[model samples]
Target: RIEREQHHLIESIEKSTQYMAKRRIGALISVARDTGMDDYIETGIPLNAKISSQLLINIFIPNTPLHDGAVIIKGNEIASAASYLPLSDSPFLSKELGTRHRAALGISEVTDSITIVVSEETGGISLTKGGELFRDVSEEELHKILLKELVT
Candidate 1:
């Protein structure tokens, strides 16, 4: 029930902000500044924002060989910072603030490039940029492909 509610809510939120375009190169830098997204992906990037969560999971990749094979997902991914860290292989990854979402967030946060992480399982896309996450990609917004990951 919770997941369903959040899924709808986040999706709705994403729909509204689908048009705020930023340069591809500077998108991640922008999000981090807005929601303290860099608190997680600060490895390569530097941000002076306050520590929000030990790290923020932000969103889950829906379906892909990489997501299916690379990440070991357990339960609902709308996790809090506390849970996300213990779930990470490197709890201190955020010491440098590195996260999987970094690249996606990097592209969205920095460039005209949008790091759209599409969940193959749910057909959900999380628009990443400027170190910020917007879960509301509308029906019109889409990734080139939608895939579900299979365990290796």
Candidate 2:
């Protein structure tokens, strides 16, 4: 049962990301790790609430109040919604990428946190960590990454 929280968090993220991709909803999610994200992110709104698939999906639905920025997840809780992240001005990045991708890369460059991004235009999913962006990530790859990084 000790691993239940990790399992649930992974499931929630997987479900939410997939749902967003399918619906062409834009979303940015950062899963904090050993590094404290407060130093690297503009903590928008403190939630401090349990994480769930539906809650995440709802937050990112188009034209919603909280759909514009990033969501920070800390220890199975939705730390904040609409949190702003730093943007990377890397020339190596593709011109096709948007602000969301830059923000995801920016947070990853400063912290050990993992960031997930769903494209509003292409309906594609991407994961970023260690200043690296893995674009077009599949659900299975996302699950593996979460399990490896989150589970002790």
Candidate 3:
């Protein structure tokens, strides 16, 4: 758990993730909590850059390779992007679940990280925590979840 509340950082993350949802930017953002996910999420170029709303937005712009994979953020720094994650083989998963959702759960199972997936076609935000997937999250709901999961 986060030791202290990071208000502005959380807000920026919330704003960008929500914007990606609305614009259907097709992004997967995995937040590193207590777990070290480098073993699970791999193949992306290391950025090690400061987090920003625009940086997140630009990475997922259509046609970019980063648009296809996930972004892993650790401690307000973008560790990498276009990172490939394993796909889940859960038989109980709904047929409606897409690649992003599958990958979110795939990483979540081993890492215990929180993954937020934004679908480009449906413009829906899906949050995956532990092994549970919460679909169709709104901006407010995303903020609350982010706060609880990443900030405080």
Candidate 4:
């Protein structure tokens, strides 16, 4: 049985996952309302329209060809160490995950960071650090998780 507050951790993970899917880094609705759909999303984008999951089309923007320099990385689990690699050269390459892209995705599976991989070998955009993304977590709580999972 677990001794810690599993609910907070579980919920934090869920919220960050949702945050990852959102286009919060940039504005969307404002542009849409300001410029209208055509000029705002369709005309500006350069996508050739590839058939895939509905979510694919929904998530895409103009001129954005699926991925623009994607990178993925994984953490050391016991340490802050992480390795990143481009996803285009190969599908999701991360040493920890056996590929960077896959490893980045793998890291997301555990941490609260939105971890955005930029192209060119590998780049990381950490939306939130520690385990406090959606909700505000106290220093003590974050310390507990780190100590429990990593530092011991």
Best by lDDT: 2
Of the two candidates 1 and 2, the one with more favorable TM-score, higher being better, is 2
Count of clashes, each model: 38, 0, 0, 11
Model 1 per-residue lDDT tens digits across residues 46-117: 222232211112212223211221111112231121111112232322332334344454444443322344
lDDT of 3 by residue, 77-112 (tens): 788998888788988678777888899998888787
Rank by lDDT, highest first.
2, 3, 1, 4
lDDT of 4 by residue, 32-97 (tens): 111112321222333333222232323323344433222121121111111222122334333432
Stretches of candidate 1 off by over 4 Å are 1-102, 110-112, 141-152
Pick by TM-score: which candidate is best? 2
Q: Model 3, stretches more than 4 Å misplaced? A: 1-5, 40-42
Candidate 1 global lDDT: 0.30
Specify the poorest-scoring 10-residue window by lDDT in model 3: 1-10
After TM-score superposition, what is the CA distance of residue 15 in candidate 1 from its true location, in Å? 17
Look at candidate 1 and tell me the lDDT of residue 89.
38
lDDT of each: 0.30, 0.88, 0.81, 0.28
The TM-score of predicted model 2 comes to 0.94
